[PDB]
Design an enzyme around this catalytic site. Structure first.
Site, PDB file in Angstrom:
ATOM      1  N   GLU A  35       0.495  -1.422  -0.125  1.00 60.53           N
ATOM      2  CA  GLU A  35      -0.084   0.039   0.242  1.00 60.53           C
ATOM      3  C   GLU A  35       0.974   1.579   0.036  1.00 60.53           C
ATOM      4  O   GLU A  35       0.051   2.110  -0.876  1.00 60.53           O
ATOM      5  CB  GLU A  35      -1.216  -0.242   0.846  1.00 60.53           C
ATOM      6  CG  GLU A  35      -1.829  -0.780   1.156  1.00 60.53           C
ATOM      7  CD  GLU A  35      -2.728  -1.056   0.234  1.00 60.53           C
ATOM      8  OE1 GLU A  35      -3.045   0.110  -0.562  1.00 60.53           O
ATOM      9  OE2 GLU A  35      -3.201  -1.392   0.164  1.00 60.53           O
ATOM     10  N   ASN A  46      -7.755   9.254  -6.515  1.00 65.87           N
ATOM     11  CA  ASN A  46      -8.172   8.210  -6.736  1.00 65.87           C
ATOM     12  C   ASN A  46      -9.449   9.166  -7.594  1.00 65.87           C
ATOM     13  O   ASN A  46      -9.532  10.459  -6.864  1.00 65.87           O
ATOM     14  CB  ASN A  46      -9.509   7.813  -5.964  1.00 65.87           C
ATOM     15  CG  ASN A  46      -8.231   7.369  -4.172  1.00 65.87           C
ATOM     16  OD1 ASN A  46      -8.445   7.003  -3.153  1.00 65.87           O
ATOM     17  ND2 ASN A  46      -8.269   5.428  -4.945  1.00 65.87           N
ATOM     18  N   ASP A  48     -12.637   9.109  -7.698  1.00 66.77           N
ATOM     19  CA  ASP A  48     -13.722   9.126  -7.204  1.00 66.77           C
ATOM     20  C   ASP A  48     -14.264  10.393  -6.041  1.00 66.77           C
ATOM     21  O   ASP A  48     -14.713  11.645  -5.635  1.00 66.77           O
ATOM     22  CB  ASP A  48     -14.494   8.567  -6.856  1.00 66.77           C
ATOM     23  CG  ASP A  48     -13.855   8.273  -5.193  1.00 66.77           C
ATOM     24  OD1 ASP A  48     -12.657   8.335  -4.586  1.00 66.77           O
ATOM     25  OD2 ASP A  48     -14.012   7.131  -4.290  1.00 66.77           O
ATOM     26  N   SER A  50     -11.798  11.307  -3.741  1.00 66.61           N
ATOM     27  CA  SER A  50     -11.796  11.080  -2.561  1.00 66.61           C
ATOM     28  C   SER A  50      -9.752   9.875  -2.935  1.00 66.61           C
ATOM     29  O   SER A  50      -8.633  10.834  -3.682  1.00 66.61           O
ATOM     30  CB  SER A  50     -12.274   9.369  -1.729  1.00 66.61           C
ATOM     31  OG  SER A  50     -11.582   8.085  -2.656  1.00 66.61           O
ATOM     32  N   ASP A  52      -6.322   7.954  -0.631  1.00 67.97           N
ATOM     33  CA  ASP A  52      -5.898   7.515   0.159  1.00 67.97           C
ATOM     34  C   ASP A  52      -4.904   7.677   1.339  1.00 67.97           C
ATOM     35  O   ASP A  52      -3.920   8.455   0.570  1.00 67.97           O
ATOM     36  CB  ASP A  52      -5.376   6.050  -0.443  1.00 67.97           C
ATOM     37  CG  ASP A  52      -6.304   5.350  -1.003  1.00 67.97           C
ATOM     38  OD1 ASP A  52      -7.957   5.822  -0.597  1.00 67.97           O
ATOM     39  OD2 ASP A  52      -6.242   4.294  -1.946  1.00 67.97           O
ATOM     40  N   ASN A  59      -9.029   5.468   3.394  1.00 66.67           N
ATOM     41  CA  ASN A  59      -9.517   6.113   2.106  1.00 66.67           C
ATOM     42  C   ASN A  59     -10.802   7.358   2.824  1.00 66.67           C
ATOM     43  O   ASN A  59     -12.017   7.269   3.522  1.00 66.67           O
ATOM     44  CB  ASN A  59     -10.099   5.552   0.974  1.00 66.67           C
ATOM     45  CG  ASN A  59     -11.103   5.978  -0.068  1.00 66.67           C
ATOM     46  OD1 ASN A  59     -11.962   5.967   0.757  1.00 66.67           O
ATOM     47  ND2 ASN A  59     -10.291   6.577  -0.832  1.00 66.67           N
ATOM     48  N   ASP A 101     -15.166  -4.590   8.960  1.00 69.58           N
ATOM     49  CA  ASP A 101     -16.586  -3.821   8.428  1.00 69.58           C
ATOM     50  C   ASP A 101     -17.147  -4.880   7.458  1.00 69.58           C
ATOM     51  O   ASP A 101     -17.994  -4.127   6.920  1.00 69.58           O
ATOM     52  CB  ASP A 101     -16.435  -2.930   7.439  1.00 69.58           C
ATOM     53  CG  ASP A 101     -17.209  -1.659   7.368  1.00 69.58           C
ATOM     54  OD1 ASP A 101     -17.479  -0.962   7.545  1.00 69.58           O
ATOM     55  OD2 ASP A 101     -17.454  -2.130   5.342  1.00 69.58           O
TER      56      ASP A 101
END
Ligand code: NA
Length: 129
Positions: A35, A46, A48, A50, A52, A59, A101
């Site tokens: 990562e 990203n 969208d 967003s 990270d 994120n 989650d």
């Protein structure tokens, strides 16, 4: 800060990640390597809108507040800058929550594609743990 492999392993162990939700330490080290290359300061934007953040690339849609991710949530209750600290404490706390989650470590794309199903114990070999 850029961690060494065994230094990060130790830090993750002290903060309670070995074998958390059944994920041995090597999974977590492996995920960090791919990562972030073990860089706490790593940020990636990203498609969208967003971003990270940090050693585990957490994120901004869902887990932290950056102020520029409209309609997003902040589940971890933190500023995303908290995730760039040399103290990986807040990253680890938020990641617990993430790995709870429902999809486990599949929440990390790098983990799925580069660590899942491999000899993850190789990431902690040699370390004094
Ligand atoms: Na957010």
């Amino acid at each position: 800060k850029v961690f060494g492999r065994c230094e990060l392993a130790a830090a993750m162990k002290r903060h309670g990640l070995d074998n958390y939700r059944g994920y041995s330490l090597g999974n977590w080290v492996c995920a960090a390597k791919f990562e972030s290359n073990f860089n706490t300061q790593a940020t990636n934007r990203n498609t969208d809108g967003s971003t990270d953040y940090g050693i585990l690339q957490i994120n901004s849609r869902w887990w932290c507040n950056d102020g520029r991710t409209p309609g997003s949530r902040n589940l971890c209750n933190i500023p995303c800058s908290a995730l760039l600290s040399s103290d990986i404490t807040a990253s680890v706390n938020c990641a617990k929550k993430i790995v709870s989650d429902g999809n486990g470590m599949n929440a990390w794309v790098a983990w799925r594609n580069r660590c899942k199903g491999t000899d993850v114990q190789a990431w902690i070999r040699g370390c004094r743990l």
